Design a binder for this molecule. Structure first.
Ligand SMILES: CC(=O)Nc1ccc(O)cc1
Length: 115
């Protein structure tokens, strides 16, 4: 409360560490469905069904231009990529499997790096 503060966690390296994690995501061999925005003109159903599209290149642009206020808003966008993927793709599809794999990959890096 007013003039009563918790000890200050060091957040000065958060931007650099998130960028490192995103680089490792971008270079994973199963990243290919997620590198660029889904083409809303060419993929039936995607625009109407998926209310907030998100992809690695969009996250990279937001990270490089100061659009994440903290490391949690960054994690929310990464998770959104995989939540969208589950919504639109069967678990037993190449893209469905890729999404499950990448989510597992991310959450381990997240825990090891910040928790
Ligand atoms: C990330 C993603 O769901 N991409 C995607 C899914 C189905 C399709 O027909 C084309 C692209």
């Amino acid at each position: 409360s007013m003039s009563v503060k918790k000890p200050k966690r060091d957040d000065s390296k958060d931007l650099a560490l998130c960028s490192m994690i995103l680089t490792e995501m971008e270079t994973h061999e199963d990243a290919w469905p997620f590198l660029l925005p889904v083409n809303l003109k060419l993929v039936p159903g995607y625009k109407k069904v998926i209310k907030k599209p998100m992809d690695f290149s969009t996250i990279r642009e937001k990270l490089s231009s100061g659009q994440y206020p903290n490391l949690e808003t960054f994690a929310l966008d990464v998770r959104l990529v995989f939540d969208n993927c589950e919504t639109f793709n069967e678990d037993d599809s190449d893209i469905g499997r890729a999404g499950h794999n990448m989510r597992k990959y991310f959450e381990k890096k997240w825990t090891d790096t910040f928790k």
